[PDB]
Design an enzyme around this catalytic site. Structure first.
Site, PDB file in Angstrom:
ATOM      1  N   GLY A 197     -22.156  -3.731 -21.395  1.00 18.70           N
ATOM      2  CA  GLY A 197     -22.257  -4.302 -20.071  1.00 18.70           C
ATOM      3  C   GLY A 197     -22.795  -3.319 -19.054  1.00 18.70           C
TER       4      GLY A 197
ATOM      5  N   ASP B 181       0.824  -1.202   0.000  1.00 13.51           N
ATOM      6  CA  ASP B 181       0.000   0.000   0.000  1.00 13.51           C
ATOM      7  C   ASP B 181       0.867   1.264   0.000  1.00 13.51           C
ATOM      8  OD1 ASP B 181      -2.267   1.805   0.398  1.00 13.51           O
ATOM      9  OD2 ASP B 181      -1.637   1.853   2.507  1.00 13.51           O
TER      10      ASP B 181
ATOM     11  N   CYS C 147     -33.734  16.795 -25.158  1.00 15.60           N
ATOM     12  CA  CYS C 147     -35.185  16.786 -25.035  1.00 15.60           C
ATOM     13  C   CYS C 147     -35.648  15.356 -24.769  1.00 15.60           C
ATOM     14  CB  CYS C 147     -35.844  17.316 -26.312  1.00 15.60           C
ATOM     15  SG  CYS C 147     -35.695  16.175 -27.711  1.00 15.60           S
TER      16      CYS C 147
ATOM     17  N   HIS D  12     -26.194   9.895 -21.788  1.00 12.77           N
ATOM     18  CA  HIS D  12     -24.842   9.475 -22.121  1.00 12.77           C
ATOM     19  C   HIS D  12     -24.745   9.374 -23.641  1.00 12.77           C
ATOM     20  CE1 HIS D  12     -25.279   7.884 -17.969  1.00 12.77           C
ATOM     21  NE2 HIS D  12     -23.983   8.117 -17.876  1.00 12.77           N
TER      22      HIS D  12
END
Ligand code: MG
Ligand code: MG
Ligand code: MN
Ligand code: MN
Ligand code: ZN
Length: 883
Positions: A370, A10, A384, A364
């Site tokens: 998927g 990490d 619209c 979008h």
């Protein structure tokens, strides 16, 4: 015999969490072998660079990876691996022409974020017809060029914008390692002073390439003119055989960045230790930091910029609240819809019709194969209801080709996008330009965004790729993943274990107070699977969608779209639960370590110049006090003064007119003046001023305050035994640099001795002091803190009782040590006391050596795995109890 070892790393800005896990054949965690948090301790030269190892090229220096020619080479070689399937059986490579168009495309905009679907569209193929895609999960970019266009240094960015390839390359080479050209630094010196100051904050892509610019250019040009990959190109151009391979940099090969470099040392040493101790790891997982370990200062810049972000977005939510009377929860969808309406001038981007906040919907532009969608601002438009309903899950260009709706087309839509304007005060035209570029790009798109995979969570940061390269090179039988920094928190939440770890603090503030959380993060990342990475990334994508709709979020129920995916995910949750069990168990044993390297080498390091303070002159004949003598400007002078027959350890030197001493040959008489160090106004008196660390330089003296190498702990023999310490100044070890530093002699005339406790000085001169052992700043003390109930420390222990592990942060006085708690992180204090804040954050616990030693604490020295070291054949520093 060990079935499977999984290592987790990490990466932080000031730390590296490290974990080693053992799991059975099914992936069930059976043993937590290791878990620690490693805290960071905050031409006759170059090129000393290795030559090009290719035959014939050995007179050329290897190029740094930040060199434009390397960036170009890297892109080209990745593209030379791409294959096209025109028939379900065979796959041909890209032709030279296709290769040129692709490489041109990828270098138009270093700032564009592209997927392989973009490249497949540029080539004129389906995505599924494109193969040969660490194996680049995403298309490459000129990282250096992107950095230069994103720098906050105005003048430099401007200059770089203004051409050209040769100048760019020359400048990069200038900034990285070679001061010549003479064009620079005339360009650099011309730059504003503030920018020239900022220049050291610029972080070019790190790494040393395997080849020189000459070879990189050769291979590039060749691969762009043919269908050869890198292997073939090397054989044809240079003569090398099939087996020929260039060496890779070691994990700890320095890149010129402090935090990055210590991270690399920690990682390299740790992996060596792991493989030596338990065997070669099956997996090495890394959570990168995003963003980022460019610096601590640059990281604080990103944190301040994140404050700005949070606050301005909050202001947006407020604006919606007062403008629309919005009740309660305001979605990202409301915000985006509003922003889009303002941008598009209340018009559908697809057909041009008027829309308002009530009538508009958010779409979008490009759908994503998927679960989920790509939720970038640049893939969101105000539309619209009719256009949105008609378009459905279809890409805009495909839909517009046959929608047969008036004023709907790619041309008309792009036309609208070009008409967008800032509409906001002090808003960047840069960000808007990026946004328009992206929107237009997606308006042209005829293929879906690719489905989320196991690589969607992979970090694409340059240093992440470099780290991947190095570790994979060093451990070639091991699979290596370097994930983005968001994956551990995602994992912990999704497994529901974020409240089951017995760490210090309360569940669950933003920042964590227990430094052992890095070890947790590492453990978790070691446990990460491909299927789970996919599922998590999908869950995030879904969440983004539902956040854009504003409705009730269902994504938490999503654990895979196939049966095997859900099986993997549930199994994984079980594993996370077991890992929690193991971690808490090891936490009970006090075997989740918190380590920090201790500094054993002399400061490089004292070459820096300070403003010399004025020396004070005293007439020798008027006599001197012991205090004045002890602050003599040179040790030889001190010797001369204390050698005198009428010298008194209490009363110093009496007044005489016949006195005559010899200091380095020169004769000093009663009518002469000797110099001493002083911090008093010279109109004041220094008769009783006690000595402090100082050396004489040109024009006076300087204080060598903090510049202490180590402290030797002595026991002054009683009677009443009294523990004291000698802070040895770095200056007093230079002559014996090449020897044992902890045994080197420190004479009575040394500034170190002269600044020590008089009791200790006397104890040492008369053979009454016993050398116990040494300590340095960074060393760990294990202390019984039962007897400390008074003052700030006691009040600190009221809130954090049984805080037994401390770190030496400095020497407060010549008899007092400064300590801070190791396990606790100041960055996780929520409205603390004054005592807690003093001990942890500000002054620290300042404690007399005698007092401290009375409880017989233990100096703890740890190995590469964090384990206490009690004995060594390698003469490495061992732990010891101060008795
Ligand atoms: Mg839609
Ligand atoms: Mg989708
Ligand atoms: Mn992390
Ligand atoms: Mn961390
Ligand atoms: Zn419309």
């Amino acid at each position: 015999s060990a079935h499977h070892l999984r290592v987790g790393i990490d990466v932080g800005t000031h730390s590296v969490g490290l974990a080693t896990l053992r799991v059975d054949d099914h992936g069930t965690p059976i043993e937590l072998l290791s878990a620690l948090s490693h805290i960071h301790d905050s031409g006759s030269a170059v090129s000393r660079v290795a030559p090009d190892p290719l035959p014939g090229q050995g007179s050329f220096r290897r190029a740094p990876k930040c060199d434009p020619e390397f960036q170009r080479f890297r892109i080209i070689s990745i593209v030379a691996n791409l294959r096209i399937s025109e028939t379900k059986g065979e796959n041909r490579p890209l032709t030279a022409d296709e290769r040129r168009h692709v490489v041109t495309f990828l270098t138009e905009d270093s700032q564009a974020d592209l997927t392989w679907v973009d490249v497949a569209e540029k080539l004129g193929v389906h995505r599924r017809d494109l193969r040969g895609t660490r194996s680049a999960a995403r298309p490459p970019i000129d990282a250096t060029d992107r950095i230069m266009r994103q720098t906050k240094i105005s003048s430099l960015k401007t200059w770089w914008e203004e051409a050209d390839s040769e100048q760019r390359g020359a400048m990069i080479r200038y900034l990285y390692e070679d001061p010549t050209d003479s064009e620079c630094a005339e360009i650099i010196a011309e730059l504003p002073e503030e920018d020239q100051a900022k220049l050291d904050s610029l972080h070019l892509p790190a790494g040393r390439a395997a080849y020189s610019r000459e070879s990189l250019t050769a291979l590039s040009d060749h691969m762009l003119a043919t269908t050869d990959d890198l292997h073939e190109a090397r054989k044809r151009l240079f003569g090398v055989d099939d087996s020929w391979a260039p060496p890779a940099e070691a994990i700890n090969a320095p890149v010129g960045n402090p935090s990055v470099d210590r991270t690399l040392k920690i990682v390299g040493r740790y992996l060596s230790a792991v493989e030596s101790m338990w065997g070669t790891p099956e997996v090495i997982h890394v959570e990168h930091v995003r963003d980022g370990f460019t610096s601590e200062r640059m990281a604080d810049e990103r944190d301040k910029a994140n404050r700005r972000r949070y606050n301005d977005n909050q202001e947006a939510m407020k604006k919606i609240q007062r403008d629309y009377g919005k009740e309660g929860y305001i979605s990202r969808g409301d915000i985006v819809r509003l922003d889009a309406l303002e941008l598009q001038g209340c018009a559908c981007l697809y057909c041009g019709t008027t829309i308002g906040y009530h009538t508009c919907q958010l779409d979008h532009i490009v759908p994503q194969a998927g679960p989920g969608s790509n939720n970038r601002r640049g893939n969101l438009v105000a539309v619209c209801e009719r256009c949105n309903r008609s378009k459905s899950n279809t890409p805009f260009a495909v839909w517009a080709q046959k929608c047969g709706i008036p004023h709907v087309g790619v041309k008309e839509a792009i036309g609208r996008v070009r008409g967008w304007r800032k509409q906001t005060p002090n808003t960047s035209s840069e960000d808007l330009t990026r946004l328009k570029k992206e929107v237009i790009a997606r308006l042209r798109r005829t293929q879906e965004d690719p489905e989320i995979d196991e690589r969607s969570m992979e970090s694409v940061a340059w240093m992440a790729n470099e780290l991947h390269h190095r570790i994979a090179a060093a451990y070639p039988e091991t699979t290596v993943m370097v994930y983005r920094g968001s994956i551990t928190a995602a994992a912990r939440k999704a497994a529901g274990i974020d409240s089951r770890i017995n760490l210090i603090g309360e569940k669950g503030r933003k920042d964590r107070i227990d430094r052992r959380h890095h070890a947790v993060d590492a453990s978790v990342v070691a446990l990460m699977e491909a299927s789970v990475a996919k599922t998590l990334a999908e869950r995030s994508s879904l969440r983004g969608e539902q956040r854009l709709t504003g409705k009730e979020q269902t994504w938490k129920q999503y654990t895979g779209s196939t049966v095997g995916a859900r099986e993997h995910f549930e199994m994984w949750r079980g594993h996370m639960l077991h890992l929690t069990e193991l971690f808490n168990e090891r936490l009970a044993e006090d075997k989740v370590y918190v380590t920090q390297n201790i500094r054993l080498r002399l400061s490089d390091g004292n070459a820096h110049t300070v403003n010399p303070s004025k020396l004070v002159s005293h007439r020798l004949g008027d006599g001197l006090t012991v205090q004045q003598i002890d602050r003599a400007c040179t040790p030889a002078l001190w010797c001369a003064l204390t050698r005198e027959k009428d010298f008194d350890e209490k009363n110093g030197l009496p007044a005489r007119e016949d006195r005559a001493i010899r200091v380095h040959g020169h004769e000093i008489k009663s009518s002469d003046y000797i110099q001493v160090f002083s911090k008093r106004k010279k109109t004041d008196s220094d008769r009783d001023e006690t000595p402090f660390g100082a050396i004489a330089v040109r024009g006076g003296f300087v204080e060598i305050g903090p510049s202490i190498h180590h402290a030797r702990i002595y026991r002054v023999e009683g009677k009443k035994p009294v523990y004291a310490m000698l802070r040895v100044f770095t200056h007093d070890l230079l002559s014996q640099r090449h020897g044992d530093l902890f045994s080197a002699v420190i004479p009575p005339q040394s500034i170190s001795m002269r600044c020590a406790e008089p009791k200790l000085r006397k104890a040492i001169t008369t053979g009454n002091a016993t050398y116990l052992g040494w300590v340095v700043v960074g060393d760990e003390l294990e202390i019984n803190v039962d007897s400390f109930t008074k003052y700030a420390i006691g009040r600190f222990l009221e809130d954090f009782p049984n805080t037994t592990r401390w770190r030496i942060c400095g020497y407060d006085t010549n008899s007092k040590l400064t300590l801070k708690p190791i396990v606790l992180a100041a960055e996780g204090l929520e409205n603390p006391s004054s005592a807690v804040n003093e001990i942890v954050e500000l002054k620290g616990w300042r404690v007399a050596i005698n007092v401290l030693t009375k409880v017989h604490p233990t100096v703890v020295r740890r190995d590469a795995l964090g384990r206490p070291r009690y004995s060594s054949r390698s003469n490495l520093p061992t732990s010891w109890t101060i008795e």
